[PDB]
């Protein structure tokens, strides 16, 4: 019954939850050609796993 919609919310036997940030970007990341790709998993929200 705790109301906190920043992380999860229930729709009735189906919980949704905002996953995020498998990777984290540093300051010296500059999209160089030998930089490791992060697969858009450093943004605020890339998916919503239900």
């Amino acid at each position: 019954g705790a109301a906190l919609s920043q992380f999860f919310q229930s729709h009735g036997e189906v919980l949704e939850v905002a996953a995020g940030r498998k990777y984290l970007q540093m300051n010296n990341y500059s999209n160089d050609d030998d930089d490791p790709p992060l697969f858009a998993k450093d943004l605020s929200d890339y998916a919503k796993a239900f």
Partner: protein, 49 residues
């Protein structure tokens, strides 16, 4: 029964609303203002100031 919105919608928890800054429009305004700070930063682009 579905409605589509161009911006994100996260429902409010409390019913007496008050300020916080954790939403996408304030993130967008913050990015616009910091890039205008970056644009006014350089003396090359406008030396007469």
């Amino acid at each position: 029964e579905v409605l589509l919105l161009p911006i994100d919608h996260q429902p409010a928890n409390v019913t007496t609303p008050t300020l916080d800054f954790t939403n996408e429009l304030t993130n967008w305004r913050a990015r616009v203002c910091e890039l205008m700070k970056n644009l006014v930063d350089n003396q090359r682009y406008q030396p007469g100031w």
